[PDB]
């Protein structure tokens, strides 16, 4: 496979044993092109790895043409805006082949990085996989309790869900009030209010308090 | 899905613009594909007065060519380029297909009843005229009064090109992003 | 909202659908100005993030005109003198929108950084919020037991409170003795002793042992 | 609350001085506003012989304009600038308002009884004369012997300007920070 | 005290109130000299802090003339060869005044850094001090069980103590054998063997196998 | 021993006491050669230590001629592609002499770094060695349960073992199918397929679906 | 085990090549020595159609000079250099010793029965001719038809040098790594 | 305890040498002072054949001036400088005080019985002559045969200066560190 790629000269040397008992057909070696270590700057922290280390798993974000989206050219480095202390385990996977789970990291943030970088929770090593499954089970139970649809430890969960909904409604009302204040008299706020003005004046209707 | 394939190669975005768009896209949906639910979650944040889910459904259906179920980055970017920095013909065809809910391309005052209804419903109930139950029907009727001669795509194109006001409003956002 | 700000071209493209069924009023687009990543050096460790990432929450320290107080100009970077391993979660909040709680970090220091940078314990994500509340409850119980006003596990708490008060009194006595020794015969110590001399000689009274 | 608004724009601190002051201020109270309790906690550390809480109360009341309850950074810095690097008139008005406990501006030998009492009490009981119960009253009496002609702000200003010794003692700290 | 040293202009401004009710004695201000942030490179990881931050506790290693022993001049930085992830808490102490205890760090290594840098286990904050005392108690019990003097969970402790003594004896025998081999026929090894030769030939005696 | 090597001038000064009671034989001092700190870049994170610190244990990877394999010359630094947050404990061992065990790190990855860098689980300090042994015991029990040879908490272990075997078989089938597709019509994939072609055509046989 | 000892000093690898080889070698077996089991684990990954363990056993025995039990880095690298970039004579002796299972150097159509059997078995059962039970014997028989004159090392060398096709196939991999 | 105070100011170590010595010293005893127990722990590592604790006790007593109990860095460094790079007179006085166990300065063949006994005992029992119970006494006797004329410090100094061999052996370590 591609995981053991540094042992390609080993396999080629082993293939020499076939030649005496073969009938030389001119198997046409591919005649490849010919290795400086590259930098992955995950929000300030630089991680230096050989490109061949990343290319050995060409179905994820790091080994792909996908990382050309995150190449920042004038600094000659790949800048990701992700967690610096979880990308370490991504590189550790790319080096060996088995993911490790941090016992001290939130599993809802660990899964986010795995989803981002293309890894899957099926390749995490057996050494730390019972605890990963246990914490995933706890997170799933929390989600299920939070999504029991009670509209008409779980009691405080429902209370905090109601508080979160109230906060979302308050944020929506604050955005509407800010737009109203702007109409009466930031960077993105101006464009958002322009969009709201366009929505207003395409239907000859006006927002009021 | 290369970065150079969707470069200025019938996609109107530069390399830096493509990189920024991919960063923003993968920030919300790391899997690289966005579905209808997440589509609505982002769309409803820009319009907090009402609910834009009804309009976001038709918007996603327009974005989701071939009805795959989830729209990936390549077709998302080409749709954005067509809508923002595309030509008149592409924008008008995209809008016509957005209004055209069914497979064949027709508009019969019932297919786009929902479009105008959603456009009005995504404002909530706080406007000055307090809206009305029959105002979307009035808007649709006055809309049909300028293109529907007897009872199509050619009619839509010629009607849009005849009036310069929709012409000058379509290219509003190509100058700024 | 401002959280989904990278989807502004998306919203503008969506707004094109309104134009056919509109009556073009010349909605007057704002005609904005036009993005290099900035550095946040939190006591040695540099954290690189786009300015637009910070500006999407313009009610905290990082997204504000407040961080202009912490700009260190000749190095062209923002230097904060805070914890390097807790500002990581501040940036993770600025990227997604949900705070994460370190299970391995003291909650009295985690709350300090949240208070400093303007974040609130109400926006921390639901994934790790039961444990944050539990540890906050334990800290509050510790504070309440330490502040039961017994002047006339809790026994050793009272003992360590008395020891801390004795240490504070010893420090005060040592400062007074140091001032006395200076009067008989560091950098800040000279100015502090000058202040004490001013207090002495504004009331024609002298401190003695 | 901008950094440039409170620059050398009637605030006598430079940009670097403002940055240092904000760093030191937010080090103790990260919320950006300091209340009376924390005010006393910092003030009592400089004078460990006695308790400066009594004087720190009046000092906070002088700092806390409009009696909001907690003093923020902007008014804190303008008060510091007035006291340290301000002019004579501003310093004298600030001191007069510090002594003037009540709303209207008057001094009646009872309002500033507490001021001198706190100034003497923030030394503890370790001084050479071992103090006395009536020495703050003697200090207040000798103070009133040089400005109180018959029984105000104008009197305070003219008395301070008449004697050059208080004049040269007020500007002690403007040269060094 | 020196902990609140950035509030010295505050105290000087407060002292202005004494002047009206004073008798100006010319209290002779000290007329001080006049602040670039300095680097502390603790084995690769650089920590940048203002010198005034360190000087506010002038009885430890960092605030002292003692750190002039660890100044590495040509790089213009202080190089310490200590733990990079525990010196963070030393700086956090120097910033606020209260030490924090890492729940994930060995207490025998945490105490080593405190002893090195001059801090004491008496100034660690009350927020995390019950757990510090608990772990110190466990370490002390381990030491006491390991030092019960049984020469003639505790059983395996005695077994590992015997194994450690055997390893020490084996290391001593290996060093003696290495010296013997060198006499029959590294950098520090040559000087150590020269010292052993000096010990041999000052008493006209020779080491043999 | 070599652990206390900075005390060599101490031992030489102590040896002066032998000279008065000696008979000077000209013990022939070795006349040594004569110390800049070197960099160890473990995948992005640089660790600076004196060479004499590493050379004091000349039977492991860091103190040896073995690290000349990992020297990257044009940058004048040693680049290791290992875990950045576990090499810290390797350096801490090289400084003091006792290894510390991270309670938050997987023991199957901690042992990997010890095996790589030449250290052994016998030199880890007594302070954290009961927990290291306990976690090693849990890992060994997991391995034994996973290797009970049931071919015909342990039930889910057998289930995940079967799933892993199925994934391995699927990967093998996918590699074979990829080679078939290449024959019908990456970097390492071309050379691997060339090797497969050589194996095919040395026995005049062809792989088919 | 120095890095300079196994440099271009009868080892055909440069300093950078040795560094890369050691990095890759220690990545899989950090102890610096690889045993038969790990040997098979790496070898079987390159040929997933069948099992290469049978051939990997003889390959390890050829690599493991003096039958120590585990092969270290120095002899591993010298074997790789001999096989890849070595001369004809060294390659032919190495292959002869690989076929020569027993101690003394002889080939008797039974020692290398297993070699050809493993070479055929490492393809699985998916080939077009569906193989056969007697095809390894046919391959061995046709192999013996070109070198076995009457019933050795000299015979193997002269037979290999007589036919230029095996000559040009042996040096296939010296140009590329 | 400054770094510049113990510079080349009657201390024969440079700034870099002082920094290296302090780093090595604080590596073992972070408190900055080393006691007798730790003294023995470092001393016994250099001589593993026997036990050097008996000699390390007298060595610590010589180092620990004024019998404080624990020796700090300043006196440790000045003792090292005197022994290694010091002059003849200082080295001879230091050695005499090392032998002089009691307060007053005298040598009576019983005070230094322990010194030679420890020097012989720090070799263990593995030497070629297998040592003897009476060989330290013979060494002390032959030592007294060259300086003890009738039955002191002046005698020790003159005896050491008379024989050039001890002279040339004393300065063995000043050239190398």
Numbering used by the authors:
A (entry chain D), C (entry chain A), E (entry chain C), F (entry chain G): 2 to 35, 40 to 157, 418 to 450, 472 to 495
B (entry chain F), D (entry chain B), G (entry chain H), H (entry chain E): 36 to 186, 191 to 216
Paper text:
Modulation of voltage-gated potassium (Kv) channels by auxiliary subunits is central to the physiological function of channels in the brain and heart. Native Kv4 tetrameric channels form macromolecular ternary complexes with two auxiliary β-subunits—intracellular Kv channel-interacting proteins (KChIPs) and transmembrane dipeptidyl peptidase-related proteins (DPPs)—to evoke rapidly activating and inactivating A-type currents, which prevent the backpropagation of action potentials. Here we report cryo-electron microscopy structures of the Kv4.2–DPP6S–KChIP1 dodecamer complex, the Kv4.2–KChIP1 and Kv4.2–DPP6S octamer complexes, and Kv4.2 alone. Thus, our data suggest that two distinct modes of modulation contribute in an additive manner to evoke A-type currents from the native Kv4 macromolecular complex.
KChIP1s are laterally anchored next to the T1 domains of Kv4.2, consistent with the previous crystal structures of the Kv4.3 T1 domain–KChIP1 complex. The N-terminal hydrophobic segment (A2–R35) of Kv4.2, referred to as the inactivation ball, was captured by KChIP1, which may explain why Kv4.2 exhibits a closed inactivated (CSI) mechanism, rather than an open inactivated (OSI) mechanism like Kv1.2, as previously discussed for Kv4.326,27. Although the residues from G451 to G471 are disordered, the following second cytoplasmic helix with a short loop (C-terminal segment: S472–D495) fits into the hydrophobic crevice formed by KChIP1 and the Kv4.2 N-terminal segment (A2–R35) from the neighbouring Kv4.2 subunit. In addition, the cytoplasmic S6 helix (around S450) is captured by KChIP1 directly and indirectly, through the hydrophobic interactions between Kv4.2 (Y444), Kv4.2 (H479-L482-F493) and KChIP1 (H84) and the electrostatic interactions of Kv4.2 (Y444–K448) with Kv4.2 (H483–E486), respectively. The amino acid sequence of the C-terminal helix segment (S473–T489) perfectly matches the dendritic targeting motif that is conserved in the Shal family of potassium channels—including Kv4—suggesting that this motif has a dual function as a KChIP-binding site and a dendrite localization signal. In the Kv4.2–KChIP1 complex, KChIP1s bind and sequester the both N-terminal inactivation ball and the C terminus (amino acids 472–495) of Kv4.2, which would therefore result in preventing N-type inactivation.
